[PDB]
Design a protein around this ligand. Structure first.
Ligand SMILES: O=C(O)c1cc(Cl)c2oc3ccccc3c(=O)c2c1
Ligand SMILES: O=C(O)c1cc(Cl)c2oc3ccccc3c(=O)c2c1
Ligand SMILES: [Ca+2]
Ligand SMILES: [Ca+2]
Ligand SMILES: [Ca+2]
Ligand SMILES: [Ca+2]
Lengths: 115, 115, 115, 115
């Protein structure tokens, strides 16, 4: 699988478990078409979103549903979601790990890209 | 003005100057409609985006054109842009500062909400 | 003043107020000697730590007492403190802002160096 | 091994390889005694620093030699090192992953603590 998502909780110092993640791909008409979705495991990782065949060149949006995560823990956070938008595979296939570090009023997102 | 945006450059250790910023408000049909925009100043700040009367409760998206910023510096970026999506909530008097700290393959964003 | 420290709270989305900050300069015997200190203001900022004449080239450590900050808010922290160690270098006129963004199990720090 | 260190490069979107890491433990006389050291692998991870028997309660300092890393890549960075100071094992043994995300003028550090 060439796209993995990892989410961490900076309040608890733990993986962020059961975080919903939706991936979209920009269509020819410039709309966001649904591409894949899943939820993080007990390790905070989401594997198996897509395949080498399906994950073609394009502009992708990874929406990490941070508000739903915080609300399930009884917390009212600031952001609706974390949104990571990037062009993928423009110079051939790559493997992408998208990591997000979450706090109620702040997040960071980082990409590790390997060949 | 109840909404300010501040952008910093983690590679050069400087304000991120002349970065385009677009603010959208979510419409009833779930589309994003333009709300305010500008370019960051020499201090990395964008003031005067909106007024108290215009900035009603709702869902807002702040899109920071990070790819064009890095390209103007000759540095290869990952993201198309940085997105910050949040709900404005009238809980007494409030001023929102949206800060973004930019690196080529990572960004962080924080909200500082003060009375 | 050539050195300012700014501290933000990523859990509450606020300046980090009344945080103790200690600055040390590395002495010839590799020990850290006290140089300046204070507490952050209601804006999360600590101004007036030093003067142009006092702030010579050398290695400095900024220690931010994050554990006491979180304890005063009733929140369980990981770190004893946040440390920022850097060399001051006379490359033309320079002002240093050391910013720290605090969460219970994570912090980030950035230097904004301006002319 | 109950202490692992992971380092990422936010400029390249890659593991930070060959980063030196020194761990110290506060001694009874309040000095930092050397505890363990190593270097990150091609994955950006440093395993095998210590053992369950050796990693007793205490206050530990993890120094990540970021300046040497950037200088080996031909870059002049701001910080001397990243310094992570924490009390370990106070409520019994835990496993600690310390992650650092590096840019030339900024870094973040996060702890994931598991039982
Ligand atoms: O007001 C400033 O001068 C200033 C300077 C720095 Cl380095 C800053 O770094 C930051 C790093 C992460 C998140 C927010 C900030 C800031 O809001 C910030 C503000
Ligand atoms: O693989 C891990 O166990 C692990 C642990 C921690 Cl704390 C991590 O913190 C991070 C903080 C910012 C950006 C990325 C990461 C990570 O990718 C990360 C990975
Ligand atoms: Ca292509
Ligand atoms: Ca309301
Ligand atoms: Ca010099
Ligand atoms: Ca104990």
């Amino acid at each position: 699988c060439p796209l993995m998502v990892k989410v961490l909780d900076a309040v608890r110092g733990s993986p962020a478990i059961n975080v919903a993640v939706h991936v979209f791909r920009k269509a020819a008409d410039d709309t966001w078409e649904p591409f894949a979705s899943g939820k993080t495991s007990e390790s905070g990782e989401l594997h198996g979103l897509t395949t080498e065949e399906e994950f073609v060149e394009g502009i992708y949006k990874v929406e990490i549903d941070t508000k739903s995560y915080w609300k399930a823990l009884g917390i009212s956070p600031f952001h609706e979601h974390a949104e990571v938008v990037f062009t993928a595979n423009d110079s051939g296939p790559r493997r992408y790990t998208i990591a997000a570090l979450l706090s109620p009023y702040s997040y960071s997102t980082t990409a590790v890209v390997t060949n």
